[PDB]
Amino acid sequence: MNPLTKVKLINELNEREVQLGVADKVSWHSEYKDSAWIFLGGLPYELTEGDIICVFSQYGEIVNINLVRDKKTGKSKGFCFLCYEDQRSTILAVDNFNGIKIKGRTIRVDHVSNYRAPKDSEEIDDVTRQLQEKGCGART
Amino acid sequence: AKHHPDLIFCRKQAGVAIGRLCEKCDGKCVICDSYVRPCTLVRICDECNYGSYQGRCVICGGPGVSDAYYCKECTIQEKDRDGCPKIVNLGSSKTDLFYERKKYG
């Protein structure tokens, strides 16, 4: 099953909801209300984390970022997890940003449930340790 | 049907599957399309009740609600012996009706 059909399946999830007239208290997103983590998939490999944060900031303030990278070479696998400060920004981003094109590639944005953080057992990098323990965020 | 010259029967070797008819087709004969005097039960070939199609209408293809029979006159002429009487193509009339309603509606 091609990834584009996954992008289309989330969009049809939304259109179908509109046709049936479902209320927001029982929307599909309400199953993911507890979490503030969203999966982004299909990204171009040229994008770095400043790019991801630069664009997905339209809907709120990003708390943490996990663009998963190859262990040996360090290059990007293409998918990362973002945590928003508001949980409602996840609704806005899954609706609005699913299936948009960046450098000619469509991306899928979906809610992630019970996201489990990476263990700091590895001492491979330092900046990743800073990102895990502290993470990106405005400083007064 | 006898009213549509472009429809085509399956005519393969019929089997132990019983052919059925949807509410619209209930009480009519599969061959000559009559309402009277039902003589024998219709058997359909294996392929025609494959899978999801098991139990659909013989004549049109909708959800079947009763058993299909041949009439007495088709029995006497031995029209009941030609094969699977499942209709295998929609034909021009059914297709035209769809596009016409869809144009309007």
């Binding site: - | 132990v16 019983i18 039960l41 058993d67």
Partner: protein, 235 residues
């Protein structure tokens, strides 16, 4: 096991194995089983008297079931396999679904160890083991013969000699050892445990073939899958 012990004692002319003097006499049940094991190899008669077969096996320093199987069964190649019976490089000489066959090409290419992952010690003994078994066959007029196909020739010998070991994991009439789909019956050299039941050095064998050889000891169908319709269900 007391099986070979009996064939060695019954050679000595001891008519009573119950009351014979040992320092610590073995269980009476283990005797009855051992007496029963030489029975089904045809090394004895029904009343416990030696046959021409049983008298012959005692000239081999072997387990009698194995020797019997070899004799009954490929004589040059049984002489090859039985001697042996006493993973990349493994693949080349190891035919799928069988262990004697794998052993067969093992020795055959030996007289044709380090780089094949074989031990020069095991083979140098087996070289002499095969050497002595040949001298023992020739002495008593056991004919030297060859067959067109070794797999067919060797399969029969395993079924006969070892028949007491056959499994239908598998069920004996147990799980496979790390050593090695149509086949459902097997024949196996040795049995061992670590945490479980382990089957060692095995060969595929049809149930029907075993019955033909050992009818007393042992004393596929194509059927249509779907049930059809009865007259009541049809109308």
């Amino acid at each position: 096991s007391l099986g070979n012990v009996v064939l060695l004692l019954k050679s000595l002319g001891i008519h009573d194995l119950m009351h014979f003097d040992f320092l610590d006499p073995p269980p009476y049940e283990t005797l009855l089983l051992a007496l029963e094991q030489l029975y089904a190899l045809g090394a004895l008669n029904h009343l416990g008297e030696l046959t021409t077969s049983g008298r012959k096996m005692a000239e081999l320093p072997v387990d009698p079931m194995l020797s019997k199987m070899i004799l009954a069964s490929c004589s040059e190649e049984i002489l090859t396999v039985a001697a042996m019976l006493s993973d990349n490089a493994r693949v080349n000489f190891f035919l799928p679904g069988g262990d004697h066959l794998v052993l067969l090409n093992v020795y055959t290419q030996w007289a044709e160890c380090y780089e094949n992952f074989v031990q020069f010690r095991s083979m140098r003994r087996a070289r002499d083991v095969r050497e002595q078994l040949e001298g023992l066959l020739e002495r008593v007029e056991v004919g030297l013969s060859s067959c067109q196909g070794d797999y067919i020739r060797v399969r029969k010998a395993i079924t006969a000699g070892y028949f007491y070991h056959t499994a239908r994991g598998y069920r004996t009439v147990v799980f496979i050892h790390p050593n090695s789909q149509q086949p459902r019956w097997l024949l196996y050299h040795e049995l061992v445990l670590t945490t479980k039941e382990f089957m060692r050095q095995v060969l595929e064998i049809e149930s029907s073939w075993l019955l033909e050889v050992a009818p007393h000891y042992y004393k596929a169908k194509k059927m249509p899958k779907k049930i059809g319709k009865t007259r009541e269900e049809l109308g």
